[PDB]
């Protein structure tokens, strides 16, 4: 919830339509994590919930602006998923549908926002549609989702999809150099390891994450040439196992890409690594590992409580058997 600079060009045309009437009563914004998806929705609603707007932004005084700064307002409706569960309910929707079926308490526009539409119950989708078909005069909606395909075709048709494009890399890196002092080479790695999201990139550093990531590449650099992959156990076996396994995967991908002579590489941070890696590991061996790392990372995230230790030890030792001459590595199923 912090207004970033790249959110402007988009925010410009989005008000430019709410001022000239061209505004679409249902808006689906697609954007990578930490791209300021958060701040754009909120920033837009403050413009429509103003009693006495000053042109491009609000006044700060009016009932709207004040009850807005106070958060609590009779026209702003936050549709967060049911606290506890990872999905949303058919109930919440219906109760906000009929909530809008009655006159706006402050006499103006009414607005709705969704955390992530790709997380709702199938029934919750349909239950929402009928309202967009019968739009209560002068109301506004704001959908938001990282992945708009995993959304019902009949639903994503009613809204206007708007792509919140990660800013050009040169701009994102400069912005980043300010928030944290690190080699630009590192900075770019974080950016790329976030699909371009400068926000997530930034967060990659703020814990001690990056340092935790440096530990991983050092371990890997030892193992790659030595064969002792089981040495990674200390680097990976941790609650942050999944985030780490993913890291290990991006390095695997890269080595794979290099075998095909692919110009682009995510881990610019350590080209020497991806090189050696690709040198000692055939494109098949790499495929094999990439997967086990992949499926194993998932059982850690999904299954309630397996042994982080055993599973990984198994992943590790198993990786080493793929590396031995004569072994017939695995093939995907179904």
């Amino acid at each position: 919830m912090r207004w970033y600079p790249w959110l402007r060009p988009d925010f410009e045309k989005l008000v430019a339509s709410y001022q000239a009437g061209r505004g679409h009563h249902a808006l689906l914004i697609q954007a990578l994590p930490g791209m300021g998806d958060d701040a754009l929705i909120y920033a837009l609603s403050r413009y429509l919930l103003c009693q006495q707007p000053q042109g491009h932004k609000s006044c700060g005084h009016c009932r709207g602006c004040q009850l807005m700064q106070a958060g609590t307002h009779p026209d702003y409706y936050t549709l967060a998923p049911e606290k506890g569960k990872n999905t949303l309910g058919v109930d919440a929707v219906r109760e906000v549908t009929e909530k809008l079926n009655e006159h706006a308490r402050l006499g103006g526009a009414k607005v709705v926002w969704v955390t992530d539409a790709a997380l709702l119950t199938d029934a919750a989708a349909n239950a929402l549609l009928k309202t967009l078909e019968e739009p209560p005069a002068e109301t506004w909606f704001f959908l938001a989702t990282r992945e708009p395909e995993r959304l019902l075709a009949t639903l994503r048709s009613r809204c206007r999809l708007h792509y919140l494009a990660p800013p050009p890399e040169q701009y994102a890196v400069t912005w980043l150099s300010r928030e944290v002092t690190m080699s630009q080479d590192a900075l770019l790695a974080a950016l790329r390891l976030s699909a371009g999201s400068p926000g997530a990139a930034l967060a990659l550093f703020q814990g001690d994450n990056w340092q935790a990531r440096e530990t991983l590449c050092q371990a890997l650099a030892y193992s790659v040439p030595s064969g002792d992959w089981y040495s990674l156990l200390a680097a990976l076996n941790h609650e942050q196992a999944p985030a780490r396994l993913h890291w290990l995967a991006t390095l695997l991908m890269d080595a794979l890409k290099r075998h095909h002579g692919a110009a682009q590489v995510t881990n610019v941070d350590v080209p020497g690594l991806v090189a050696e890696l690709a040198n000692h590991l055939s494109p098949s061996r790499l495929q094999a590992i990439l997967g086990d790392v992949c499926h194993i990372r998932e059982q850690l995230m999904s299954v309630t409580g397996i042994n982080r230790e055993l599973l990984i030890t198994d992943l590790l030792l198993r990786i080493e058997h793929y590396l031995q001459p004569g072994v017939v590595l695995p093939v995907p199923h179904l």
Partner: protein, 338 residues
């Protein structure tokens, strides 16, 4: 802080009851007896109220601190027994204990009890505060040479003629669980009212009782013949042992073999065992295991354990026992690539 052994307590207690008694160790029996010895002497004084408060992250802090911040208005004295955490006092606890330590006086006897504190945990403000007023009783379980001696001593006071071979039998079974050796001696006394605990008698009753640790499965599973491990495994479902608790007993010893077999030419077997701190006779057995399990066998055994670990947590009821049988079979015979 008069540092002393469980035997030494009764004599000291006679001279004068001190401010605080810390009972630090792992022996259930030893801790209890010392605890009982203190209180028996206190209740003789006028110590009517008795209290116990357990310290660990999360179990009611503001209540502990305040419960002793209050004095004693008409001076009904109560025993306060602080139960230290299983791991030992952390950075934060050292303070909460310290706050409590300042709640003392002649009419408020403090008794703290837990296992042995580390030389570090012993510098801690709270500990050094009692270091002139209190007494420390080391309640810890007996070494290999005196375990038999302890059994003989404990048995003799139970008015028992415990033969030497028999004594050893009892020792080789329940090795180290003094609570068990004491119960066993007491049960053995009901069996033979006679008093005469000869080897034949004791041997019969010990083997007949048929009790087995999860460890005996593993101890057997260490390249020892499968027959007895399969026996113990199917005799471990008769003591009501959960599967999950078995898998994490096998895992711990299995991953340990993995690291050790991996360190041949890294360091001679000898020093490595010390390094891992589990080598406690298990050494010759652990190495016997290392010597006939191939780097690869050990691996396969890790996959199985993993499937099982998931099979048991994905369908959450897929009869893992079967796999445990299959697993115990891999640690004894050479496997294939199928």
């Amino acid at each position: 802080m008069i540092r002393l052994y469980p035997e030494q307590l009764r004599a000291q207690l006679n001279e004068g009851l001190r401010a605080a008694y810390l009972l630090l160790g792992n022996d259930p029996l030893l801790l209890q007896e010392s605890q009982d010895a203190v209180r028996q002497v206190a209740a003789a004084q006028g110590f009517e109220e008795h209290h116990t408060f357990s310290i660990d992250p999360n179990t009611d802090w503001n209540a502990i601190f305040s419960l002793c911040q209050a004095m004693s208005l008409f001076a009904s004295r109560q025993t306060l027994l602080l139960l230290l955490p299983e791991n030992g006092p952390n950075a934060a606890i050292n303070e909460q204990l310290l706050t409590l330590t300042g709640l003392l006086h002649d009419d408020l006897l403090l008794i703290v009890r837990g296992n042995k504190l580390s030389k570090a945990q012993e510098n801690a403000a709270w500990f050094t505060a009692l270091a002139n007023r209190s007494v420390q009783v080391t309640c810890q379980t007996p070494e290999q040479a005196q375990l038999p001696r302890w059994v003989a001593a404990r048995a003799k006071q139970l008015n028992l003629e415990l033969d030497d071979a028999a004594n050893q039998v009892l020792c080789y079974c329940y090795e180290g669980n003094l609570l068990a050796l004491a119960q066993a001696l007491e049960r053995l006394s009901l069996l033979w009212p006679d008093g005469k605990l000869t080897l034949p008698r004791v041997e019969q009753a010990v083997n007949d009782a048929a009790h087995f640790t999860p460890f005996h499965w593993v101890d057997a599973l260490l390249m020892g013949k499968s027959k007895r491990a399969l026996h113990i495994l199917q005799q471990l479902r008769l003591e009501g042992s959960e599967p999950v608790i078995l898998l994490r007993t096998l895992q711990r010893e299995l991953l340990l073999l993995v690291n050790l077999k991996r360190q041949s030419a890294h360091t001679p077997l000898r020093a490595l065992f010390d390094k891992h701190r589990v080598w406690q006779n298990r050494r010759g057995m652990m190495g016997e295991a290392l010597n006939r399990l191939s780097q690869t066998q050990l691996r396969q055994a890790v996959q199985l354990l993993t499937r099982t670990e998931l099979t048991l947590k994905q369908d959450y009821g897929q009869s893992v026992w079967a796999e445990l049988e299959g697993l115990s079979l891999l640690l004894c015979h050479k496997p294939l690539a199928d």
